[PDB]
Amino acid sequence: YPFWAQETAPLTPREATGRIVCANCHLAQKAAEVEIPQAVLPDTVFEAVVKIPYDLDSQQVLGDGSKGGLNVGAVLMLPEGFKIAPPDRLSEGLKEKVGGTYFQPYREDMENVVIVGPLPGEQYQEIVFPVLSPDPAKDKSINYGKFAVHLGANRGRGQIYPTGLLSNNNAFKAPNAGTISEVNALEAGGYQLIGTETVDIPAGPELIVSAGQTVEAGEFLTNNPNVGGFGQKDTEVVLQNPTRIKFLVLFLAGIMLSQILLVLKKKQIEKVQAAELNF
Amino acid sequence: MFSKEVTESKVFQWFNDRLEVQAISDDIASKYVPPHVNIFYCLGGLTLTCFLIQFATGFAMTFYYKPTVTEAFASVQYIMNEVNFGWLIRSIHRWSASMMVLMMILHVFRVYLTGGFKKPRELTWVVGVMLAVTTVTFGVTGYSLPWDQVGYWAVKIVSGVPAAIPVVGDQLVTLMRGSESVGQATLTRFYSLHTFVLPWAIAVLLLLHFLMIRKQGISGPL
Amino acid sequence: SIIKKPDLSDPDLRAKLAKGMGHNYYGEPAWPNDILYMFPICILGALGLIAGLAILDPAMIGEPADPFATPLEILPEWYLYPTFQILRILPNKLLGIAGMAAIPLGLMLVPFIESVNKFQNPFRRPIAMTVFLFGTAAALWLGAGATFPIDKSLTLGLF
Amino acid sequence: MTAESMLANGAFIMIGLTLLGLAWGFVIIKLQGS
Amino acid sequence: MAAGVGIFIGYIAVFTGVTLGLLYGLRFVKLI
Amino acid sequence: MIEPLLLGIVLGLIPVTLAGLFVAAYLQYKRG
């Protein structure tokens, strides 16, 4: 889940290469989106609609073995100074849009990074993250500028536990080139396959090698039941100073008016030149 | 070019007496813009506008930017944050680099689709292509100056491709990087190129280009 | 505006027009009509639009360079997107460098190849407009490919 | 709205506003009528 | 944005009004 | 990184400028 990211890599979800740690265990690579405004004035609640779109009807192997519904989580790494708007700052419309989603900081003193999830995917195909932009005026550390907003949004179960074992939602592969001497269910979906190295698989994926065909090391013994996947989407949000745009609008209106006066001075010189040519 | 009031003023008569500045006026006034010229013939000149902004704001950023591997990123974030209007100067510089290259591409489309390059103006087009190469070199050398992840790795990639040549390519890579590996020598050399070598190369190429367009004039009607 | 008429009686202007030059001798006055008044309209347009793009979309301070960690997606500037795609998709590095160098030298050869025909109008240059529009679509397609993953770069994921 | 969308919308607005630029200048020329 | 198209229309309209106010005004006082 | 706004300006201006240079060319090529 997202809290095993807190455990595995407490310092930060993002590595130096920019690969969120979610990928270390969620091996598949589905899409992910963030609808964050191109710019947000300071000290203003806005919304970051994190789309985690997976096929609704697709079913994934639950840990027990029986298929079920996927869930959706995410690690929205906002810029420095940003946070999740407190409920009082939320508007009633955004009180409704956000609902009862619980947002937690990846760690204390790191409120910018927020880890939602796990949430039932049926009704969280889009998770509205209510952000609150910082005020550079109040906080000297914060400045106005374009800042990167990295999202890691994941649906479905992982493939590797923090213990390093492999989950049932994973295409198992051959440890050694050993013929499959025995394959048995014992009223379960697990299969103790058989160098004839005896290996066990859980009750997740259906075998693609059920026959007594010889096996070689590396070759996938089972199908890949992973219908979900982790995705990451890096965007940008400009913390814009309103005064910058006031003076920009004033400067560009000055330029527009000066261009008008340039065309009118050309009209005047054209009149003078036309009278000069006339004799 | 000089109105009657300026022509009769004793100051202008002083300059005319010594450097005969009136000849400049006659040469500037003798020219005419043919009817076929349209708004798209502005694109070349706007390519120069974006360069002159890039010349000015680059001069601005040389006063604060420190081309060192320990201080280049800190000095770029100092320009942005601490320096007065350094956010504006750096953002204008990035934007005028992109807009210089875009205005240049649009200018090559104008020229090509107006037959500007055709005989007798083959050399204006060739100096054009050289200018274009010089501008993309300005873009590449600049991309790496912040010594951020994007810049450092872009210089890593681009500077190592000369290695493709079996023997000579290794020497070209050691020359581009100024060392066996992208490091402080690569940043000192890319900065010397960006802020010194390439402004002089593009200014000599701009003077050649504009002298050939002045001599030959504009292309004919389509 | 007053428009000078080409004084074709002048043998010097006719000789210049024969060589393709001498189009700066007729039409509207260059100064002050166009140079003094109209050029600053474009200089102020560009200065205001670059300042507005800078203010609205300021430059982004990236991360400090890590020599040990390569960004998942490293990209050059947009103008080197077709140049960069060529590199990645072409297997042999040396053909990639040959293509990168063939862009500017082929451009330098455009005038000599095309000057066989004297007609400047695109509609009187069928083969040159075919090669140009095909090459513009190919450079825009390569540039768009650079952004995509290497698997979906050549098709833009479309098919 | 979002920065990403300014790839598509920003391109069409450009196409839209270049011609609206062009056209409006002609409108001024026609309107001045001198 | 629809608000953006409204503000754009207003911007252009006012600037046309000032350009043509100035044009016909200066032509009237004969400055053009 | 990809700058979406800048590539919007680029993909907007390139085809409108090409269309406008082909229109100016057609109109010069026309015979009244």
Partner: peptide, 29 residues
């Protein structure tokens, strides 16, 4: 009125207006 909208519309309007002032001054395109 959103100041972000007004900034984007000011830049868009200055692009439109510079094109219109160049075709107005030059009397054509």
């Amino acid at each position: 009125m959103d100041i972000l909208t007004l900034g984007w519309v000011s830049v868009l309007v200055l692009f439109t207006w510079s094109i219109s002032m160049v075709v107005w001054g030059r009397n054509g395109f």
